[PDB]
Amino acid sequence: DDVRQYVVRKPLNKEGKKPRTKAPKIQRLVTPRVLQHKRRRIALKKQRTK
RNA sequence: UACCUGGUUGAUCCUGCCAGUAGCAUAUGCUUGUCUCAAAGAUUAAGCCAUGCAUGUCUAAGUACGCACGGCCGGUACAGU
């Protein structure tokens, strides 16, 4: 399942500005950038053996 | 700049020390217009200390749900300060 969309949201209300909602940055999500760092980590091992 | 002078006797020649003469660095007295440098609670007590200051620190790159401030609307991890 997708871990996004199920994340809890916090509503903001005050007399001045419009309503808003907040949610946190997620800390173990395995995005494409995490996978890209894992690929270079093993490309450096191959280069040293050559 | 490798230098001496007064003082023992009625007078002389010596020994020998006292006093004078020049510099240096601590205190102290009288006196003082301009201008460039600049030592300064060591000496006695490593004695006793009111008050203030004398050591802090963030980048594109460890952790941002602070309505704290904010956008054109939306969290697509999640904007931005």
Documented resolution in Å: 2.9
From residue A34, alpha-carbon distances to A29, A38, A39, A40, A45 in Å are: 9, 6, 9, 11, 18
Query: What number of helices (H) and strands (E) belong to chain A?
Result: 1, 2
Residues with CB under 7 A from strand B: A 4-5, 7-8, 10, 12-14, 16-27, 29, 31, 33
Q: What CA–CA distance (Å, rounded) separates A11 from A17?
A: 13
CA distance A3 to A26: 9
User: Which of A28, A23, A1, A19 minimizes the C-alpha distance to A10?
Assistant: A23
Distance A13 CA to B17 C1' (A): 112
